Structures are given as C-alpha cells and as structure tokens.
C-alpha cells in the first residue's frame, strides 16, 4: 500500500471574452459624456486615470460605438438616461452569455482529452445573471451533454464564487474518481451599468468588466497524469470578523448593483495574513514555500493590500496585475484568468528541463467579508 489517494486535478481550462475591447481612455470619455455626471468629471479623471486598467471587455457595443459590430444594437437609451428594467437586463445577459459560455465550455472539454458525453456534473457560477430555465439548461442543448447531467447554479457569491465552484467540483470528483465535472464562471457587468451620481458607483463603473472562464476537473491518482501535474490538494475559508460592510450586494429595478466599503482594502490587509498562514500551517508550510500567488485582481487596492499583508513583491503578483491591466475586474472568473497565465508558465518550464512550480495558492474575497482560497501542489 504505497498510496491510492485520489487528488482533484484541473484536466482543462479555457478563457473567454466578448467582442468589445474598450481602452480606459475610451471608457472615461463615454462616462464623462453622460449628462448628470457632467459635474462629477474631476473625480472620474482621478478614478479612471489612476486605475492601471489599460482595457476592459464588454458584451454590449454602447461603450465602443465607433467599432460596433454590424447588426449589434445599442442596448442603452438614446437620451443618455441609462434606464433599463432589471428583467430586460437579465434578458440581455442570457442573449450574450449563451454564445460566450458555450464556446468557453467547448474549449475546456477540448483541453482535456474528452468528448462532450463525458461530463456528469455541471456548475455554472454567476452574480450578474439569473434567468428562468438556466445557463445550465442552455449548455446541455448547445453542447449536447447527456440529459442526466447533475446541475448546480451557484448564484450571487460575489468575486470569490469560483473557489466555491471548485470545492463543489473537487468534492464530487473525489467521491467519483472516474467521473468528470465542468465548472464555468461567467459575468457580464456591462448589462448592469447605471452611471449613478455617487462616487461609489463611479468606482464600480471604472472597474467591472465582462469575462468567462471554464475548467474541467478529474479524479486522479499519482500515476495517471504527466510528471509535473498540479492537483488542488486543499481548500480554505475564513469569515473575517467585523467586516460585514466590506462587500454589499443588491438587486434593484435598474440592475444588479454593488457597494464596496472604503475600509474594505484595510480589512484585507489586517486579515489576509491570518488566512494564508492558517491555511499553510495545515501543511507544515510557510509563505516562502509558495512559488506563486493567484490573488484576485479586484482592483488596485485589493492587490496592493494583499501584497502589503503577505509581504509579496510586484513580481509575485505580476499575473494578477497583468489580468487587471488587460481585463480589469471580471468578477468571479478573474482568478481563473490568473491561474491560466500561471498554468501557461508552468508547462512551458515542464516542456524544458525545469520542474515548474511545487506549491501555489489562489485566493479571492466573498461577501462577508470571507476569504476563499485553494492550494495546489505537485502530485
């Protein structure tokens, strides 16, 4: 009995984005051209100018009308009121999510040596889309998944919801070694734009964007995979005390909206060390044993205060900074993106002589405020 322990492994991953790459210069010009926010322009220039978000992707052409696709209508009213009822907004979510989420799912299944029939469990994760028959239903028809597939819709868990999706998958996949589970996170914040008079909303409107990421998971022993394979060995959470006001969500008539506390980055700085050191103590490890960090690119302060809290260099978080610059905050699939660049650099090293990474941690933040995170080591 040398060992027969089954470890949860990401057998494949895919990254997705809608048509419209909007540079922060164009985003600033649009927001400032909106009437009502005409007396709020000085703060807009400070938020957009000091965002190191180079570009953001949107499903809707309204932010980039000069290069709008032919036959793609502007979603927001002509009078610049940005008044669309919430149900109509969710209709547009579905409208634009289906083509996106089915493509990313397909490429995920393609990354593993798998056919569509092989998926027994489906997890769709969103906080921006809640619809009748779900995207889970839509992915069964467009990809032709066996109609007996297990369905879970993890809704409204904020930017950390990928971690929760991973847990659910690992639990199933560890219970069912030979079986395969698909986990997709998709967000379309370009549907919930209001351009409200307050600075809180102004901050969100400069940060949140569209994106999608899918990952396939399998139950694997240490003799079924290639040499430098990484398995999610452990997971961790901590509901931070006295942080209740950190991330507040709400569904309102004019869209699904958010309020991020001023002291939210401070909450992270004061608590993040306790999370990571507690997580690592389980495995007799320290901060220094970790080769890479997938911090959620929820914005500048998020990454910076994680850096300050954990004492990490700009080089240790370069992948998070990279996803923030090119994509911005895509909400829940944002960490998956960071994991993708990491999984690209790992493998590239494995192609050459190098052993690649031995230990890595990926974490983000949930409404609570909670710290959700996973640890992958080499099997």
Ligand X SMILES: CCCCC/C=C\C/C=C\C/C=C\C/C=C\CCCC(=O)O
Give Cβ neighbours of residue 202 (< 8 Å, ≥ 6 apart). 31, 37, 40, 43, 44, 47, 196
Identify the active-site residue in 22, 34, 137, 159.
159
* Site for ligand X contains 243 (CB under 6 A): no
21 phi and psi, to 5 degrees? Answer: -80, 110
Q: Does 92 bind ligand X (CB under 6 A)?
A: no
Q: Name the binder of 189 from ligand X, a second copy, none, CB < 5-8 A by kind.
A: ligand X
Identify the CA nearest to 365 among candidates 205, 255, 248. Answer: 248
Contact by Cβ (8 Å): 30, 80: no
- Contact between 26 and 55 (Cβ < 8 Å): no
Options 104-112, 191-199, 204-212, 235-243: segment touching a second copy (CB under 8 A) = 235-243
Binding mask 70-99 toward a second copy (x if CB under 8 A, else -) reads ---------------xxx--x---------
Here the tokens at position 323 are 């996803």
Q: Give the whole-angstrom CA distance, residue 57 versus residue 330.
A: 9
Residue 27 contacts ligand X per CB under 6 A: yes
242 binds a second copy, rule: CB under 8 A: no
Looking up tokens 């610059």 gives 325
CB of 152 to a second copy, least distance (A): 5
Query: Is 159 one of the annotated active-site residues of the chain?
Result: yes
d(CA 209, CA 100): 14
The reply to whether 154 sits near ligand X by the rule CB under 6 A is no
In this structure, the number of other CB atoms found within 10 A of the CB of residue 308 comes to 15
Q: Which stretch binds a second copy (CB under 8 A): 36-44, 224-232, 239-247, 351-359?
A: 239-247
Please confirm whether the linkage preceding 292 is cis (ω < 30° from 0): no
Q: Which residue has the tokens 């597939």?
A: 149
Question: Of 108, 366, 375, 376, which one interacts with a second copy (CB under 8 A)?
Answer: 366
Task: List binders of a second copy among 103-132 (CB under 8 A).
Answer: 130-132
Judged by CB under 8 A, which stretch of 11-19, 33-41, 189-197, 229-237 contacts a second copy? 229-237
The CB-of-83 to a second copy minimum distance in angstroms stands at 11
Question: Which of the residues are catalytic?
Answer: 159
């Amino acid at each position: 009995k040398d060992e027969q322990t089954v470890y949860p492994v990401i057998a494949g991953m895919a990254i997705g984005n809608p048509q419209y790459r909007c540079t922060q210069n164009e985003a600033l010009a649009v927001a400032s051209k909106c009437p009502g926010l005409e007396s709020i322009k000085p703060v807009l220039e400070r938020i957009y100018g000091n965002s190191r978000i180079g570009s953001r992707y949107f499903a809707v052409p309204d932010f980039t009308p000069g290069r709008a696709a032919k036959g793609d209508p502007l979603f927001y009213p002509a009078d610049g009121s940005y008044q669309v009822p919430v149900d109509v907004r969710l209709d547009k979510f579905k409208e634009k999510a289906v083509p996106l989420v089915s493509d990313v799912a397909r490429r995920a299944i393609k990354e593993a040596g798998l056919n569509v029939e092989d998926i027994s469990k489906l997890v769709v994760v969103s906080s921006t889309g809640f619809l009748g028959p779900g995207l889970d239903c839509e992915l069964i028809k467009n990809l032709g998944l066996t109609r007996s597939v297990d369905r879970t819709l993890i809704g409204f868990m904020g930017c950390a919801a990928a971690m929760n999706g991973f847990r659910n998958a690992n639990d199933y996949v560890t219970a069912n070694p030979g079986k395969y589970a698909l986990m997709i996170c998709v967000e379309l914040s370009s549907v919930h734009t209001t351009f409200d008079d307050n600075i809180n909303d102004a901050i969100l409107h400069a940060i949140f964007a569209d994106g999608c990421a899918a990952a396939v998971l399998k139950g694997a022993r240490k003799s079924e995979c290639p040499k430098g394979t990484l398995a999610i060995v452990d997971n961790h959470a901590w509901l931070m005390e006295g942080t209740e006001d950190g991330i507040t969500l709400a569904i309102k008539p004019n869209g699904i909206t958010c309020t991020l506390s001023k002291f939210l980055p401070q909450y992270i700085a004061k608590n993040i060390a306790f999370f990571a050191d507690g997580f690592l103590k389980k495995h007799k490890l320290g901060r220094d044993d970790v080769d890479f960090w997938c911090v959620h690119p929820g914005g500048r302060r998020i990454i910076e205060e994680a850096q300050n809290g954990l004492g990490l260099s700009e080089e240790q978080t370069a992948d998070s900074w990279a996803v923030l610059g090119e994509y911005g905050n895509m909400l829940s699939p944002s960490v998956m993106f960071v994991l993708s660049r990491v999984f690209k650099r790992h493998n590239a090293a494995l192609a050459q002589g190098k052993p690649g990474y031995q230990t890595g941690m990926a974490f983000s933040f949930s409404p609570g405020v909670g710290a959700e995170g996973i640890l992958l080591r080499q099997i």
